[PDB]
Amino acid sequence: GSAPKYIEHFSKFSPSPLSMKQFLDFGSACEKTSFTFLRQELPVRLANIMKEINLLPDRVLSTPSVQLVQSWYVQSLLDIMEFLDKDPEDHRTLSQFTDALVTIRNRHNDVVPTMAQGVLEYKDTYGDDPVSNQNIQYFLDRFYLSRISIRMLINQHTLIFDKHIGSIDPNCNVSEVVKDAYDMAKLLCDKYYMASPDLEIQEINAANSKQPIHMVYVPSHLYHMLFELFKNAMRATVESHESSLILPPIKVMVALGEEDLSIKMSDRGGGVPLRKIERLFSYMYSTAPPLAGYGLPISRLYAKYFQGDLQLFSMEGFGTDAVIYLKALSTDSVERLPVYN
Numbered sequence: 001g002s003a004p005k006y007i008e009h010f011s012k013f014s015p016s017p018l019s020m021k022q023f024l025d026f027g028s029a030c031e032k033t034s035f036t037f038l039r040q041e042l043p044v045r046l047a048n049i050m051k052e053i054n055l056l057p058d059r060v061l062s063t064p065s066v067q068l069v070q071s072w073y074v075q076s077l078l079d080i081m082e083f084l085d086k087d088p089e090d091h092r093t094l095s096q097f098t099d100a101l102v103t104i105r106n107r108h109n110d111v112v113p114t115m116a117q118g119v120l121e122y123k124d125t126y127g128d129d130p131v132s133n134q135n136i137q138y139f140l141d142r143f144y145l146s147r148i149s150i151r152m153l154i155n156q157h158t159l160i161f162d163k164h165i166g167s168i169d170p171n172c173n174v175s176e177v178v179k180d181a182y183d184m185a186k187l188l189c190d191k192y193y194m195a196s197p198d199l200e201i202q203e204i205n206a207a208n209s210k211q212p213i214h215m216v217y218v219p220s221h222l223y224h225m226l227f228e229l230f231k232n233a234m235r236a237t238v239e240s241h242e243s244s245l246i247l248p249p250i251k252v253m254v255a256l257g258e259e260d261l262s263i264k265m266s267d268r269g270g271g272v273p274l275r276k277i278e279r280l281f282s283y284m285y286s287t288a289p290p291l292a293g294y295g296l297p298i299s300r301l302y303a304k305y306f307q308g309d310l311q312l313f314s315m316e317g318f319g320t321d322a323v324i325y326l327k328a329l330s331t332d333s334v335e336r337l338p339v340y341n
């Protein structure tokens with residue numbers, strides 16, 4: 001077959017990062033334009049990461065987990081090729097493309113735990129030295145960020161072409177998503193422990209005091225990050241106080257500035273020493289044989305994906321602040337994509 005040839009062809013192109021603006025307009029031009037865009041852009045994005053996978057050393061590349069994921073990417077690229085010559089005006093072309101995208105999305109559902117098995121095997125077969133850790137971190141941050149970007153494209157297409165524009169809410173109420181993610185975390189926390197901390201939210205709308213804070217965002221991404229952070233803040237608060245009786249609440253501040261929309265989650269879970277902070281973001285050090293890959297490093301990629309970030313600052317003996325940084329403005333919300341070279 002031609003998969004290596006295709007990988008070589010399409011890996012010559014740079015992925016084309018889109019803004020919220022471009023994402024919103026695609027959900028007004030129409031389906032024909034999304035098809036002609038995606039049938040070029042997905043092969044570019046697939047090929048770019050596949051080429052990087054092929055640069056891994058043979059002792060990583062030859063393992064079953066990487067071979068299995070490499071085979072998903074090959075099939076998914078070939079499924080998209082079928083459509084390069086097809087005629088956009090034929091509505092049978094268009095509905096078949098949507099079908100093809102749903103299959104591809106489903107096919108890659110188990111990438112995270114599959115890659116996690118590759119990390120476990122590497123730890124036991126070659127060891128867990130700091131240079132191994134940086135290469136795993138380098139590779140998986142790029143791989144998972146690439147994968148987030150591909151799921152975004154597919155989701156926008158399949159959801160729009162069967163108020164919200166697919167996975168985008170142009171009027172996302174940040175505090176509502178905070179409450180949702182808290183309510184779910186509380187549910188799990190009450191089940192596994194005899195207690196759960198309460199929630200306090202404070203908003204700070206710098207330019208428009210007391211006006212509720214809204215933004216253009218992908219609320220499922222924001223929920224994913226807030227849920228992960230609530231789980232950690234709840235486990236820590238509960239376990240650090242099981243001999244205590246009082247249970248400090250989790251305090252969330254939502255700040256809207258000129259360019260940043262910032263969400264701080266503060267707990268009194270007794271904190272972590274600075275030395276152990278880097279480990280919490282490490283795919284390697286957080287892989288082993290939360291509440292009852294991994295949550296923190298992947299939550300940080302979701303934040304990075306539209307030019308944001310997620311930082312942890314702890315105070316050993318007191319507690320931990322987690323901050324999600326997002327761009328306030330849809331104009332500054334552009335895909336961050338790993339480019340091959």
Ligand SMILES: CC(C)c1ccc(COc2ccc(CC(=O)NCCN)cc2Cl)cc1
Binds near residue numbers: 058066
């Ligand atoms: C996520 C899984 C699949 C996984 C597991 C492990 C790895 C790590 O791969 C390594 C390990 C060590 C080195 C240093 C070195 O000596 N370089 C020589 C390279 N020839 C480079 C790389 Cl790319 C990545 C991804």
Ligand SMILES: NC(=O)c1ccc(O)cc1O
Binds near residue numbers: 237271272312319320
């Ligand atoms: N264990 C911790 O103190 C802790 C870790 C991560 C996080 O997001 C919050 C926390 O309290």
Ligand SMILES: [Cl-]
Binds near residue numbers: 026034153156157
């Ligand atoms: Cl789209």
